[PDB]
A paper describes a structure:
Cdc23 is one subunit of the multimeric anaphase-promoting complex (APC/C) which controls sister-chromatid segregation and the exit from mitosis by mediating the ubiquitin-dependent degradation of cell-cycle regulatory proteins. The Cdc23Nterm subunit has 282 residues, with six cysteines and five methionines (one S atom per 25 residues), and is thus comparable in size and sulfur content to the lysosomal protein from mouse solved using S-SAD by Lakomek et al.. The sequence identity of Cdc23Nterm to other proteins is below 30%, making difficult to find models in the PDB for molecular replacement. In this paper, we report the structure solution of Cdc23Nterm achieved at P13 using a S-SAD experiment at λ = 2.69 Å (4.6 keV) and the related methods and we discuss the instrumentation.
The wavelength was chosen to maximize the Bijvoet ratio, on the basis of the available energy range at the beamline and the expected diffraction resolution of the sample, following the decision-making model for an S-SAD experiment proposed by Cianci et al.. TRUNCATE and PHENIX confirmed the presence of merohedral twinning with twin law (h, −k, −l) with an estimated twin fraction of 0.37. Clearly, the two halves of the crystal were actually two separate crystalline domains and were successfully treated as such. A variable micrometre-size beam allowed the collection of sulfur data from separate regions of a crystal, which would otherwise be discarded, thus overcoming crystal imperfections owing to the presence of two differently oriented twin domains. The long wavelength enhanced the Bijvoet ratio to 2.21% (1.0% at 7 keV), thus increasing the anomalous signal to a level where it was possible to determine the sulfur substructure accurately even with moderate data multiplicity. The quality of the calculated phases allowed the autotracing of 384 of the final 472 rebuilt residues (81%) at 3.1 Å resolution. The Cα r.m.s. deviations, calculated with LSQKAB for 219 residues, between this structure and that reported by Zhang et al. are 0.80 and 0.92 Å for chain A and chain B, respectively.
Numbering used by the authors:
A (entry chain A): 21 to 57, 77 to 130, 147 to 285
B (entry chain B): 20 to 55, 77 to 135, 152 to 284, 295 to 308
Write the structure that this text describes.
Amino acid sequence: REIRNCLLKCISECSERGLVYAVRWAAEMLNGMNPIEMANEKLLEVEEKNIYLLAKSYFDCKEFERAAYTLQNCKSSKSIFLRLYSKYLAGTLSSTNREFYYISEVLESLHYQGNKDPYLLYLSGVVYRKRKQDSKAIDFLKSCVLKAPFFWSAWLELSLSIDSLETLTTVVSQLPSTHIMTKIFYVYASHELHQVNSSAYEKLAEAEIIFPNSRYLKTQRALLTYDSRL
Amino acid sequence: LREIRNCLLKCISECSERGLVYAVRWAAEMLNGMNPMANEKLLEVEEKNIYLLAKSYFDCKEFERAAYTLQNCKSSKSIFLRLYSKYLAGEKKSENREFYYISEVLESLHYQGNKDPYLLYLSGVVYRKRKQDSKAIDFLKSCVLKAPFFWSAWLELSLSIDSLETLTTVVSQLPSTHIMTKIFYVYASHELHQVNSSAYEKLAEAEIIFPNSRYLKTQRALLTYDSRNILTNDPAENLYFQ
């Protein structure tokens, strides 16, 4: 009955491959095989490993409602995030979606409880933008990226929440100036605002030395040369 | 900076776990956009980055791109993913060759010392689709002996079996008493509708291992029907096709 290591090894190898139906089955078996014999965050992730693995399996089979139901009493922010995302995926993120208010509320309660997991901060940041609360969206998205600096989707929503060169200059002065992503952001943002100057080209060159054969950076260079030319 | 690397890896791992596929794809592209008995795991380490990328494309349903990414990769995981990406891309285009190229690639690999189970699985699947049942059983049988908890291979095996004879035969070649051999026999018998005494015996034996397993619970309902709410549900869902 400690054989269930074989279920884990299967779940791992099949998810890697991505044999989703094989995983789903293995997860279902894994859960419901008897009682099994921030620091606090990872500890809850260990407690919910099996329950998460299951929900994610349902999620990868597009069985979203079931994925959310699976993690209904789960306290880890990974589980909470997945639950909330799965919920949204029934019927990117919009006000007309049936689950949207519910998400909002769940995220509000979590903020008053002093949660600041980046992916939930991200979610918060997204929802506030959609509700035309730009200055609050920036607040949450800024926090997110400080904690999760290589999480591109948060930088994009951040750029979308910024509507002036002032508001931009402000935010940029609150991010790690030396950090590679702060630079990659400033090039993206400056372009999307069309307030492209010397420093943007300077920073893009600095990024290209790190990522010489990146399609994204190549597309940015094209976009900068085109803005300057008008 | 080789820390930028590690932060991209931590992102890829956390975002994949969270279902954020587009975030992963980006991170992977960046990651591969910087300068640089069994030995299988050693090749997996070599191709970690190239794999991570292809899998990102694969999770965005960008199958052809995923396959092209791993074209020169030698690990059976990469090979499998490559060939599987092709199959799936092939199967969407249905609405046939392509299975041919896969077939051939799998043949050459089998003469070469290779019999990785997930490739055997792939072989097994492709032969069934080409109406070669007796050959599909051969490969799927090998697979499950090596990879006994890999459900998708047992299901394709059951699908490749069309008589109680062909079933009884195959079952006599699997570790009788191995757990999954029992779970299989219950599924297969039901899916062929020749259910007997022993099926109920074996299901009870499985249920003491997995007392709250949704799948086993569905099987029990399906057997108790066979002996003569869940029936209300979709047969495709209950047989785990879907």
